[PDB]
């Protein structure tokens, strides 16, 4: 038996389980005390997403080790974002400004193309020049090409509840201010890309 600390950044709960019990018991223990479902969360240990069937003996967990609790995100992330520490500077000249004519007048956007490993159609990270708002939908679909519509609808519901959503029927998707866009970049491991999209000329 060992003591384990589980924290979601706001609340820390300490547990005690034997090294042969599944960590789902410790996952359901923390999730129940947050008022959330176990599937609604994912747990990290040294940056490794813990699966339910794994045990403290399966990993090399010692006493007082911390298990980070985060909300669930799709499993297959875009291999382009396997490194959140890449220098953002060479990505800025790849950003392009583009004018789009709307029923109420033209508007300027800034686009950054990102390789989609699942489709031949080009995918772009988009930024509106007027308010520097960034589409959270284009960020999510870029980082998780194999995501289901339910997995997206739950994420956008989380954006509206925890961030500052901006939705307009004239422009598709869910849009967030630059501060929220850099927070999503941390979850999606897209920091160098969003950092360059915000610093690009409009």
């Amino acid at each position: 038996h060992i003591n384990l600390k589980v924290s979601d950044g706001s609340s820390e709960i300490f547990f005690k389980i034997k090294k042969t019990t599944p960590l789902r018991r410790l996952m359901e223990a923390f999730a129940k005390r947050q008022g959330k479902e176990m599937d609604s969360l994912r747990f990290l240990y040294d940056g490794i997403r813990i699966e339910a069937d794994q045990t403290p003996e399966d990993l090399d967990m010692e006493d007082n080790d911390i298990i980070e609790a985060h909300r669930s995100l799709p499993a297959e992330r875009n291999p382009l974002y396997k490194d959140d520490t890449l220098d953002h500077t060479p990505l800025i000249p790849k950003c392009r400004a583009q004018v789009i004519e709307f029923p109420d007048g033209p508007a300027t956007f800034v686009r950054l193309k990102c390789t989609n490993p699942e489709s031949k159609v080009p995918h772009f990270l988009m930024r509106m020049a007027k308010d520097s708002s960034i589409s959270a939908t284009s960020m999510f679909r870029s980082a998780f090409p194999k995501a289901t519509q339910e997995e997206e609808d739950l994420e956008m519901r989380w954006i509206r509840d925890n961030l500052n959503p901006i939705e307009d029927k004239r422009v598709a998707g869910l849009w967030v201010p630059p501060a929220d866009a850099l927070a999503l970049a941390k979850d999606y491991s897209m920091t160098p890309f969003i950092n360059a999209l915000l610093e690009a000329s409009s």
Binding site: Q98, I100, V121, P122, S135, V171, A172
Partner: peptide, 14 residues
Amino acid sequence: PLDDEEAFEKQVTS
């Protein structure tokens, strides 16, 4: 249809 400018426009208004 597959050019950057045209694909980006359809992506923001659909």
